[PDB]
Write a protein that binds this ligand. Structure first.
Ligand SMILES: *[C@@H]1O[C@H](CO)[C@@H](O[C@@H]2O[C@H](CO)[C@@H](O[C@@H]3O[C@H](CO[C@H]4O[C@H](CO)[C@@H](O)[C@H](O)[C@@H]4O)[C@@H](O)[C@H](O[C@H]4O[C@H](CO[C@@H]5O[C@H](CO)[C@@H](O)[C@H](O)[C@@H]5O)[C@@H](O)[C@H](O)[C@@H]4O)[C@@H]3O)[C@H](O)[C@H]2NC(C)=O)[C@H](O)[C@H]1NC(C)=O
Ligand code: RX4
Ligand code: NAG
Ligand code: NAG
Ligand code: ZN
Length: 598
C-alpha cells in the first residue's frame, strides 16, 4: 500500500542522493583535470568516468518505475523523483553516448587549442584567443588588423569543427527524443518549468528592443566619425570587428570612442589597478570581502588551495574560458580563471564568485536540489554584485576612481557604458539559442546552416562579419559555449532578472529610492549590506528545491520574470539618447546584410 511505500521511497531518495553526489564528485574531478590540462590521457579519463556514471543513471531511471511516485502526498518527494527520471544524454545507447562524449571533447579541445599567426610577423604563430587575440580585438583601432584576426580566429575555432558539430546536433536530437522531448530545444527549455517561457522572453525582448536600436544607431554614427564612411555605412549593419569583442556580444571596449560626453569622465580603472599593484589573488580576496561584507559565506580553504587563478606558465594546453566548479562534497568548490588585471576582469571574478557562493549556499540540500532555481538564477548572482562594483560610488571607496565629479554628463557616460554591456548583450544572447534551437528542431537544412547563423545576428543585433562568408565557412562554434555545448538562454534570463535582484537589494539596502535624487539606481552600492545579503541567503539556500518563482518570491516577494527593472535602471539613458539621436538626425535600423552568400 501507498502510505508504507512513500515512507520507503523517502529512505530510498535519501541514500540515492548521497550516492549520486559521490559518483558525481568523481566525474567532476575528471572534467576539472581535463579542463585544467588538456591531454589525450585526461580526455579518456573524463569520458570513461562519464560513460560509467551514465550507465548508473540508466539504472536509476529504471528503478524510479518501481515507486508509484506520481501518487505520493509529498510534493517534495515527487519533485525529487521527477528530477531522477530526467536522464538527458545518459538516455543514449552505450555506444552513442561514448560517441557523443568524444564529439564534445573534440570540439571543446579544438576551441581551447586555437592559435594564430601575428598580423605583423608570420613567423610568430602562438597567439591564443586568451589573452593575445582578445588584446588586439579590444585595443587595436586598425580595421584591417581587426579583420585579419577575426577571420583567422573564426576559420580555426568555427569552420574546422563543422563535421563534429553536425554529429553533435544528431546525437543531441536522438537523446532528446529518448527523453520524449521533441528536440534539444525542448530539453533545454524544460529547465525553466514554464510552458510559456519562450513567449515571455519574446515579450520582454520586444519592450527593450527599441532602446537597443537607439544605442545601435548612436554607436554606428560615432564609428562613422572615427573610421569614415568607407569602413562603416549609415544604413547597413555595423561591421562587427569594430565593436571591441570577438563576438560583438558587449561593446564596452570602444567606449572611449563612442561615449556621449568625451570631455567628461568615463570610468576605466584598469590603469589604476595596475598602478596600485593588483594581482589575481588580490581581486579574488576582494570579491570574497564583498560577499562576506553582506553577511554571506567566506570562501573555504579548499577554494584557495585548489583554484587556478592565473594562466599556467608552462606550455600546456587547457581551457581558459572562465569557470566555477562544485565538487558536491562539503566546501570543495573552485574556480579556473586566466585572471588579467583589468576592470572587466574584476567583474568576471565577481561573476565566478557568484556561482561559488550559490554552491556554498545550497550544499546542504539533497543532491538533486544542489543547482540553481533555474539556470538564469545561477548566472545572475555575481552580476548583481558586479553591477554594484561598477558604480562610481564603489570604485571611489576602493581608491580605483580618483577626482571624479558625478555631474549629469558623467552620469550619462556611465549609464551608456553600462548599456554597452547589458542592453547590447540581450539580442546577442537570444540569437545564440534561437540559432541552436532551429537546428535542434530540424528547421534549417544543413545546406543553409551558416547563413542561418548570420541572418539571426543581422536581424536581432544589426551586426555582420567583416568579410564575406558562405556555406563554406561554419562560424557558430567560434563562440566558446557553442563549441562546449553550453546552453545560452541562462544568460539572457540572467541579464533580465539580475536587475530585478539589484533593484530589490538596493531598496533593502536603503540605497535606492525613485523619489530621491540622491539615491539613483545606477549609483547603488550594496557592499556591507546585511539586509541585501539576507535576501540572497533566503533565495540561494533553496537551490532547486522549489520552482523558480518560489525562489524569486523568497528574495523580494514577486513571482514573475519582468523587464520592468532593467527599463527603470536605463530610463534616464533612454530619455537622453532618444533626444540626442533626433538632435543629430541619426539614422535608426539597418538594411539586410550582404555578408553571407547563399
Ligand atoms: C517515451 O514514450 C514511450 C511511448 O511512446 C514510452 O514507452 C512505453 O513505456 C511504457 C512503460 O511505461 C511501456 O508500457 C508497457 O508495455 C508493455 C508491453 O508492450 C509491448 O508491446 C508494445 C505495444 O503493444 C510494443 O511497442 C513494446 O515495445 C512492447 O514490447 C506491457 O507489458 C507493460 O505492462 C506492465 O506494466 C503496466 C504498467 O504498470 C504501472 O505500474 C503499476 C505496477 O505496480 C500498475 O499497477 C500501474 O497502474 C501502472 O499501470 C502494468 O499495468 C502491467 O500489469 C504490466 O506489469 C507496459 O504497459 C510501453 O511498451 C512503451 N512503448 C510504447 C511504444 O508504448 C517511454 O517509456 C517514454 N520514455 C520516457 C523516458 O518517459
Ligand atoms: C561546471 C559548470 O558548469 N560551471 C558553470 C557554473 C554553473 O552553472 O554551475 C560555469 O563555470 N559557467 C561558466 C561557463 C561554462 C559553462 C559550462 C562549462 C564550462 C564553462 P561562466 O558562466 O561562469 C563563464 C562566464 C565568463 C561567461 O561565459 N559569461 C558569458 C556572459 C560569456 N559569454 O562570457
Ligand atoms: C597534464 O597531464 C599529464 C598526463 O596527461 C600529466 O602527466 C601532467 O602532470 C599534467 N601536467 C600538469 C602541469 O599538471
Ligand atoms: C548574519 O546571518 C545570519 C544567518 O546566516 C543571521 O542569523 C545573522 O543575524 C546575520 N547578521 C546580521 C547583521 O543581520
Ligand atoms: Zn556564469
Amino acid at each position: 500500500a501507498l502510505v508504507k511505500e512513500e515512507i520507503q521511497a523517502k529512505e530510498y531518495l535519501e541514500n540515492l542522493n548521497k550516492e549520486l553526489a559521490k559518483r558525481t564528485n568523481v566525474e567532476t574531478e575528471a572534467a576539472w583535470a581535463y579542463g585544467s590540462n588538456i591531454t589525450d590521457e585526461n580526455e579518456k579519463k573524463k569520458n570513461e568516468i562519464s560513460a560509467e556514471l551514465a550507465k548508473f543513471m540508466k539504472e536509476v531511471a529504471s528503478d524510479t518505475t518501481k515507486f508509484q511516485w506520481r501518487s505520493y502526498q509529498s510534493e517534495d518527494l515527487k519533485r525529487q523523483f521527477k528530477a531522477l527520471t530526467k536522464l538527458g544524454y545518459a538516455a543514449l545507447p552505450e555506444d552513442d553516448y561514448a560517441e557523443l562524449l568524444d564529439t564534445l571533447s573534440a570540439m571543446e579541445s579544438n576551441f581551447a587549442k586555437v592559435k594564430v599567426c601575428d598580423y605583423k610577423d608570420s613567423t610568430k604563430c602562438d597567439l591564443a584567443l586568451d589573452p593575445e587575440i582578445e588584446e588586439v580585438i579590444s585595443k587595436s583601432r586598425d580595421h584591417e588588423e581587426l579583420a585579419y584576426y577575426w577571420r583567422e580566429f573564426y576559420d580555426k575555432a568555427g569552420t574546422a569543427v563543422r563535421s563534429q558539430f553536425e554529429r553533435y546536433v544528431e546525437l543531441n536530437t536522438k537523446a532528446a527524443k529518448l527523453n520524449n522531448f521533441t528536440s534539444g530545444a525542448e530539453a533545454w527549455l524544460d529547465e525553466y518549468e514554464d510552458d510559456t517561457f519562450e513567449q515571455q522572453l519574446e515579450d520582454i525582448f520586444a519592450d527593450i528592443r527599441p532602446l537597443y536600436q537607439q544605442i545601435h544607431g548612436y554607436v554606428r554614427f560615432r564609428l562613422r566619425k572615427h573610421y569614415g564612411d568607407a569602413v562603416v555605412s549609415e544604413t547597413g549593419p555595423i561591421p562587427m570587428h569594430l565593436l571591441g569583442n570577438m563576438w560583438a556580444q558587449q561593446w564596452s571596449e570602444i567606449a572611449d570612442i563612442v561615449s556621449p560626453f568625451p570631455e567628461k569622465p568615463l570610468v576605466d580603472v584598469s590603469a589604476e589597478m595596475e598602478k596600485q599593484g593588483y594581482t589575481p589573488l588580490k581581486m579574488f580576496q576582494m570579491g570574497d570581502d564583498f560577499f562576506t561584507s553582506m553577511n554571506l559565506t567566506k570562501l573555504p580553504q579548499d577554494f584557495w588551495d585548489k583554484s587556478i587563478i592565473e594562466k599556467p606558465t608552462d606550455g600546456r594546453d587547457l581551457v581558459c574560458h572562465a569557470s566555477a566548479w562544485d565538487f558536491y562534497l562539503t566546501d570543495d568548490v573552485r574556480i579556473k580563471q586566466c585572471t588579467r588585471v583589468t576592470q572587466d576582469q574584476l567583474f568576471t571574478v565577481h561573476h565566478e564568485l557568484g556561482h561559488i557562493q550559490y554552491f556554498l549556499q545550497y550544499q546542504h540540500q539533497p543532491f538533486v536540489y544542489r543547482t540553481g532555481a533555474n539556470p538564469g538564477f545561477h548566472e545572475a548572482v555575481g552580476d548583481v554584485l558586479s553591477l554594484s562594483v561598477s558604480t562610481p560610488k564603489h570604485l571611489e571607496k576602493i581608491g580605483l576612481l580618483k577626482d571624479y565629479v558625478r555631474d549629469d554628463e558623467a552620469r550619462i557616460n556611465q549609464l551608456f557604458l553600462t548599456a554597452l554591456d547589458k542592453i547590447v548583450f540581450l539580442p546577442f544572447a537570444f540569437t545564440m539559442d534561437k540559432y541552436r534551437w532551429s537546428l535542434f528542431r530540424g528547421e534549417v537544412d544543413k545546406a543553409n546552416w551558416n547563413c542561418a547563423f548570420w541572418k539571426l545576428r543581422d536581424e536581432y543585433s544589426g551586426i555582420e562579419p567583416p568579410v564575406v562568408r558562405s556555406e563554406k565557412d561554419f562560424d557558430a562554434p567560434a563562440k566558446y559555449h557553442i563549441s562546449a555545448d553550453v546552453e545560452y538562454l541562462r544568460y539572457l534570463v540572467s541579464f533580465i532578472i539580475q536587475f530585478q535582484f539589484y533593484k530589490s537589494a538596493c531598496i533593502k539596502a536603503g540605497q535606492y529610492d525613485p523619489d530621491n535624487v540622491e539615491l539613483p539606481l545606477d549609483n547603488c552600492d550594496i557592499y556591507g549590506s546585511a539586509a541585501a545579503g539576507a535576501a540572497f541567503h533566503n533565495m540561494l539556500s533553496m537551490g532547486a528545491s522549489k520552482p523558480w518563482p518560489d525562489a524569486l518570491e523568497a528574495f523580494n516577494g514577486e513571482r514573475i520574470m519582468s523587464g520592468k527593472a532593467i527599463a527603470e535602471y536605463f530610463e534616464p539613458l533612454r530619455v537622453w539618447l532618444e533626444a540626442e539621436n533626433i538632435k543629430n538626425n541619426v539614422h535608426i535600423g539597418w538594411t539586410t546584410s550582404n555578408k553571407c552568400v547563399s
